[PDB]
Curated annotation (Swiss-Prot):
Protein name: Photoactive yellow protein
SUPFAM superfamilies: PYP-like sensor domain (PAS domain)
Organism: Halorhodospira halophila
Coiled-coil ranges (or none): none
GO molecular function: identical protein binding; photoreceptor activity
Residue stretches making up the PAS domain: 20-83
């Protein structure tokens, strides 16, 4: 239930949008190409994005352009390709929002066809 948990993908594997909105950290589920599958309440609180509005949109191309870099998007693609996405790093979100320092945790989902992007303020 906590950010950075070693088995976080197991816990969240069953959750629907409802339980996902209950997390203390931002949670985004993306497919291989980075299209948004799920986007919870906590993430919305940090970025101002309307969940219903971003579902279906491409995270790296349209929603979060500042993440289009080797340091974020680069690693997402490496993980999709290797099949073992799992990395944590510091990042700053600043597109159409006050510059906000966060800690990010990307981790492949158990379904093997989706990927998680977790975020919390620092
Ligand atoms: C940089 O522009 C990041 C923007 C952003 C990150 C995460 C989100 O959920 C929404 C926008």
């Amino acid at each position: 239930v906590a950010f950075g948990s070693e088995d976080i993908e197991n816990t969240l594997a069953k959750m629907d949008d409802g339980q996902l909105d209950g997390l203390a950290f931002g949670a985004i589920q993306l497919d291989g190409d980075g299209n948004i599958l799920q986007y919870n309440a906590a993430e919305s609180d940090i970025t101002s994005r309307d969940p219903k509005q971003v579902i279906g949109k491409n995270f790296f191309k349209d929603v979060a352009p500042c993440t289009d870099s080797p340091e974020f998007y680069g690693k997402f693609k490496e993980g999709v390709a290797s099949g073992n996405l799992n990395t944590m790093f510091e990042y700053t979100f600043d597109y159409q929002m006050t510059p906000t320092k966060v800690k990010v945790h990307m981790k492949k989902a158990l379904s093997g066809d989706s990927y998680w992007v977790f975020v919390k303020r620092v």
